[PDB]
Amino acid sequence: MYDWFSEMRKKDPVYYDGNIWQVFSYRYTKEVLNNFSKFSSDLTGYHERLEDLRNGKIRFDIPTRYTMLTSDPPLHDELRSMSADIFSPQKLQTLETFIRETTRSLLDSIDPREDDIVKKLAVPLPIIVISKILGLPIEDKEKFKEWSDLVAFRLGKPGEIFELGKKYLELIGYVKDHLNSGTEVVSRVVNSNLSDIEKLGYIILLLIAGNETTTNLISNSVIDFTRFNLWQRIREENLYLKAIEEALRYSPPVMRTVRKTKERVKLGDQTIEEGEYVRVWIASANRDEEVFHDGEKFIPDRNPNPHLSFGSGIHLCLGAPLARLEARIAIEEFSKRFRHIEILDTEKVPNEVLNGYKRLVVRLKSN
Ligand SMILES: Clc1ccc(-c2cnc[nH]2)cc1
172's enclosing H/E stretch is: helix 166-176
Cα–Cα distance, 248 to 285 (Å, whole number): 12
Side by side, the strands of the sheet bearing 277-280 are 14-16, 21-23, 277-280, 257-261, 39-40
317 is in an annotated binding site: yes
The dihedral region occupied by 71, where left means phi > 0, alpha psi between -120 and 50, and beta the remainder, is beta
Query: What sign has the CA pseudo-torsion 336, 342, 345, 350?
Result: positive
DSSP 159: T
Cα–Cα distance, 277 to 257 (Å, whole number): 10
315 is in an annotated binding site: yes
- Domains observed in the chain: 1-367 (1.10.630.10)
Q: Which of 80, 213, 214, 281 to mutate to test the pocket of ligand 1 (most atoms within 8 A of CB)?
A: 213
Protein residue whose Cα sits closest to atom 7 of ligand 1: 210
Q: Is 354 in the pocket of ligand 1 (CB under 6 A)?
A: yes
Burial per residue of 191-226, b for 16 or more beta-carbon CB atoms within 10 angstroms, e otherwise: eeebbebbbbbbbbbbbbbbbbbbbbbbbbbbbbbe
Nearest-atom index, ligand 1, CA of 214: 9
Cα–Cα distance, 110 to 103 (Å, whole number): 11
**C-beta of residue 235 within 8 angstroms of C-beta of residue 166:** no
278's enclosing H/E stretch is: strand 277-280
**C-beta of residue 128 within 8 angstroms of C-beta of residue 32:** no
Cα–Cα distance, 301 to 311 (Å, whole number): 21
Protein residue whose Cα sits closest to atom 4 of ligand 1: 254
**C-beta of residue 9 within 8 angstroms of C-beta of residue 21:** no
Side by side, the strands of the sheet bearing 115-116 are 115-116, 357-365, 340-348
Resolution in A: 2.5
Cα–Cα distance, 8 to 4 (Å, whole number): 6
Protein residue whose Cα sits closest to atom 11 of ligand 1: 209
Distance, CA 85 to ligand 1 centroid (Å)? 20
- Backbone angles phi and psi of 279, in degrees to 5: -95, 130
Cα–Cα distance, 335 to 328 (Å, whole number): 11
Query: What sign has the CA pseudo-torsion 82, 86, 89, 91?
Result: positive
Chain breaks in the chain (C to N over 2.5 A) after: none
**C-beta of residue 329 within 8 angstroms of C-beta of residue 92:** no
Cα–Cα distance, 24 to 290 (Å, whole number): 12
* Greatest Cα pair distance in the chain: 62
- Sequence-ordered list of residues with C-beta below 8 angstroms from that of 113, at least 6 positions apart, any chain: 363
Q: Is 151 in the pocket of ligand 1 (CB under 6 A)?
A: yes
**Polymer length of the chain:** 367
Cα–Cα distance, 58 to 65 (Å, whole number): 13
Cα–Cα distance, 280 to 285 (Å, whole number): 9
Amino acid at 240: Y
Pairing of strands 277-280, 21-23: parallel
Pairing of strands 357-365, 340-348: antiparallel
Experimental approach = X-ray
Terminal CA-CA length for the chain = 37
Query: What sign has the CA pseudo-torsion 88, 93, 98, 101?
Result: positive
The dihedral region occupied by 229, where left means phi > 0, alpha psi between -120 and 50, and beta the remainder, is left
The full 3-state SS of 221-254, as one line of letters, equals HHHHHHHCCCHHHHHHCCCHHHHHHHHHHHCCCE
Protein residue whose Cα sits closest to atom 9 of ligand 1: 210
359 is in an annotated binding site: no
- Say how many CA atoms lie within 13 Å of 75 toward its Cβ: 23
